């Protein structure tokens, strides 16, 4: 049989990202003297669309502490952040929408975006338009802070790991129906070549585990083992349940 | 005493002294003679009827010239070989893979004379 579609995606020919128009990597300021002892001020000089990304970016300008020059960073614009605003990044920085602060320095209930996994990794969690993490606690000895991620997960990271106060702009984007093939077409055209999607049940056997038959049917359980092997995993992988979810989900 | 004071966090390759070659023996023995001289630059007149015209009516000499020779060398070697003064040289590559020069002299020199001085008609 052939190599199925989800295997071909891995060698990255037609499947790489369509990156030409993107504004850049969105990162927090490198974690340096200023940010970890003090704060440092910058101005958002622009807030701009990023191609293939649902949330705006904020180009933020800072002085360079060690040389006469301007160093420009690209944040992910938090909702309510505006052009000309002053942004404060540092341990001793005040708590307002747009500032970047170590998680250890904010009371619980603070809502924070683009938050680092390890301190100084220049941001990881809750970057998509509309998401955010909450601080659900701190353990000052072996200093940690506990956060609830957008997935619902709870995770404990270093109290020095930096967030940025508030939620990411562009929320509600998924509420509007695409309405037609083209609107989706133009969507992935700026992301990657994932669209459209042939049902593996409409292929021949050589093509897919679900292929073939004199009627379209999966022919064997579509829940596949974690321990399955490449070319086997097409289906609901490692699924621990299945069927229409009835009842509220909402982690305890 | 104590340690040097480096103002920069970067460490660059020390600037070491670079010696010039003093060869124990010579490269090529005798140096090659001039590869493009005035006699090699300009190979023949071009006596076509239609090139002949350019000599009478245009004050232009028409030469078959080395493929290795540029406007400069075609001009200097014409000046040197024919005693004449050159306004501007135009060149082209003939379809048989030979380079043709249109040499326009200043109004001080008369090509037709200078053409049948070298002896073609």
């Amino acid at each position: 049989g052939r190599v199925i579609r989800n295997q071909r995606k891995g060698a990255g020919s037609i499947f790489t990202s369509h990156t030409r128009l993107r504004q850049g990597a969105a990162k927090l300021r490198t974690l340096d003297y200023a940010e970890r002892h003090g704060y440092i001020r910058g101005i958002v000089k622009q807030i701009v669309h990023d191609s293939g990304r649902g949330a705006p970016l904020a180009k933020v300008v800072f002085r360079d502490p060690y040389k006469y020059r301007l160093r420009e960073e690209i944040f992910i614009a938090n909702e309510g952040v505006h052009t000309g605003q002053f942004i404060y990044a540092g341990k001793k920085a005040s708590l307002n929408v747009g500032n970047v602060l170590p998680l250890g320095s904010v009371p619980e209930g603070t809502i924070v975006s683009n938050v680092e996994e390890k301190p100084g990794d220049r941001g990881a969690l809750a970057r998509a338009s509309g998401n955010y993490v909450i601080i659900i606690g701190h353990n000052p000895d072996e200093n940690k802070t506990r956060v609830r991620l957008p997935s619902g997960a709870k995770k404990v990271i270093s109290s020095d790991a930096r967030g940025v106060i508030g939620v990411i702009a562009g929320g509600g984007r998924v509420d509007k129906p695409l309405l037609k093939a083209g609107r989706a077409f133009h969507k992935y055209r700026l992301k990657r070549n994932s669209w459209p999607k042939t049902r593996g049940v409409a292929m021949n056997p050589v093509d897919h585990p679900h292929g073939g038959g004199n009627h379209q049917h999966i022919g064997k359980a579509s829940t596949i083992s974690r321990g399955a092997v490449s070319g086997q995993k097409a289906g609901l992988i490692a699924a621990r349940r299945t069927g229409l979810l009835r009842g509220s989900q909402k982690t305890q | 005493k104590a340690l040097k004071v480096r103002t920069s966090a970067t460490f660059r390759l020390p600037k070491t002294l670079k010696l010039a070659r003093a060869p124990k023996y010579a490269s090529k023995a005798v140096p090659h003679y001039n590869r493009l001289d005035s006699y090699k630059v300009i190979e023949q007149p071009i006596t076509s009827e239609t090139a002949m015209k350019k000599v009478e009516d245009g004050n232009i000499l028409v030469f078959q010239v080395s493929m290795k020779a540029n406007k400069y060398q075609i001009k200097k070697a014409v000046k040197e070989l024919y005693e004449v003064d050159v306004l501007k040289v135009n060149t082209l590559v003939r379809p048989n893979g030979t380079k043709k020069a249109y040499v326009r002299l200043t109004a001080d020199y008369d090509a037709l004379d200078i053409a049948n001085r070298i002896g073609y008609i």
């Binding site: 003297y33 200023a34 003090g38 704060y39 002085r63 502490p65 | 040097k4 004071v5 103002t7 920069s8």
Partner: protein, 233 residues
Amino acid sequence: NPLTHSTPKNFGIGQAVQPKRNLSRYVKWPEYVRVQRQKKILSIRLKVPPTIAQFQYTLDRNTAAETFKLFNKYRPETAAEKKERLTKEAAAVAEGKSKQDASPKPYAVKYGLNHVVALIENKKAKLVLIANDVDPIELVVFLPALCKKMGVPYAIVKGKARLGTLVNQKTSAVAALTEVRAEDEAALAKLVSTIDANFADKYDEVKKHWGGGILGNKAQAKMDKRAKNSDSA
């Protein structure tokens, strides 16, 4: 004063580009630099077995200075001196019928590793100087044991290269003394005595002493303010 103005600078983050400082502690050194330094560190952090680590007990500058000034008389023939010598005995012996003894019995420092070893085995050495260097440390480590079992007094000297200078090499790795002119006999006795009590006599004790295990000061000061506070309140 006159048109001049005192206008100090606020280097306090948030303002005033920092000045130029000594970043020497932060320099990103060539790999080869980082290795020779981290080798030294790595050699200190591991517990060092006692048959190494009996080095790092170098002779002390005073005793060694007395040992270098004594040894320095006994340098071997320079090329000039030996050419000068041959012309003497070449003429004098082949002519004046001397026994090929037209030259005196030499007194010089012995050296080279395979030389000094069979010397120690033959009990002809009265003093052996061993380097604290010698990167294939194997070439040397057995000498404290050998000198001990053969009753030869020895000392571990800083400067394998300084052993070189006195012997007219770049590096000698060992220098030994066998002979002595009677004028120097008495200082050697006292020199061997001090050295014997810093090395050979101590040896049987040093053989039980592991070295190393030394924390870096970021971790030393760390637990020094841990083991200070948590016990004594």
